[PDB]
Every structure is written in structure tokens, then in C-alpha cells.
A paper describes a structure:
Here, we study fold transition between distinct β-barrels by protein engineering and structural biology technique. Here, we discover that the previously reconstructed ancient DPBB sequence could also adopt a β-barrel fold named Double-Zeta β-barrel ([name]), as a metamorphic protein. The [name] fold is not found in any modern protein, although its structure shares similarities with RIFT and OB. Furthermore, the reconstructed OB fold could also be converted to the four-stranded SH3 fold by a simple circular permutation. Thus, these ancient β-barrel folds (DPBB, RIFT, OB, and SH3) could be readily interconverted by a few feasible mutations through the missing-link fold, [name], indicating their significantly close evolutionary relationships.
Phs018 has remarkable sequence similarity to design-1 (26–35% identity), and we replaced five residues in design-1 with the ones at the corresponding positions of Phs018. AlphaFold2 (AF2)19 predicted that the resultant mutant, design-2 ([name]), would fold into a RIFT-like structure, albeit with a low lDDT region in the 1st β-turn. Circular dichroism (CD) and size exclusion chromatography (SEC) experiments indicated that design-2 was folded (not random coil) and had moderate stability (Tm = 58 °C). Design-2 also formed crystals under similar buffer conditions to the third type of design-1 crystal, including lithium sulfate. By molecular replacement with the predicted design-2 model (RIFT fold) and subsequent manual remodeling, the crystal structures of design-1 (third type of crystal) and design-2 were determined. Surprisingly, they both adopted into a unique β-barrel fold that topologically differs from DPBB and RIFT. The five point-mutations derived from Phs018 (RIFT) in design-2 stabilized the [name] fold. Furthermore, the addition of five-point mutations in design-2 stabilized the [name] fold and abolished the capability to adopt the DPBB fold. Most DNA molecules did not migrate from the well when mixed with the proteins with the stable [name] fold (design-2, -18, and -19) and RIFT fold (design-3 and -4), indicating that these proteins formed large aggregates with dsDNA. Design-2 seems to have a higher affinity for dsDNA than design-3, as dsDNA shifted even at lower concentrations of design-2.
Residue numbers in the entry:
A (entry chain A), B (entry chain A): 1 to 48
Amino acid sequence: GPMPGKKFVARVAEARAEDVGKRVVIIPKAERAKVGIKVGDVVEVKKV
Amino acid sequence: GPMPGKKFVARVAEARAEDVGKRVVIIPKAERAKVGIKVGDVVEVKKV
């Protein structure tokens, strides 16, 4: 596979029934408060 | 709110029915190939 540290850009969404089976990162409320995330916000996801 | 650029660490999961209504980042197959993500992998999410 690729070396670690690569990233992509995405938007935080509200999960719906049609998303069952998709690959997701779940962002709990406490983490949203810490990093300042609202649904609709652009985030960058990096593989560690 | 906070300044942008803060992050938290999480693991990529398969979304289930119990996740409906949660805040998520959906990672499509093409992006998983580009960054080398598998379900179970640790990622870092940053607010832009």
C-alpha cells in the first residue's frame, strides 16, 4: 500500500439509513467541541 | 469557536444502522485507495 500521511478532503455529514455499510469516521460530540466541527464543515482526513 | 487546524484521532469503521443520526465523514472507495485506508485503520481528522 501507500506510505502513511496522505490525506483527502471531505465534509462532515449526518449519517442516514442509506449510509449503512459505508466506511466512515464517527465524530463524537466531545471531539466536535474540541476541534470546532459542525455538520457541513470541511475536514481533512489523514492516514496515520 | 476554536481556531481551525485542530485534530483528533479515530478509527475507520463500517457504518451500521445504529449509527443513523451520528456525525460522520464518509470515505468513498476511490479515496480509500488513494490514501491507503482499510476499515480499522487509525486516521487523524483536522478541521480546515
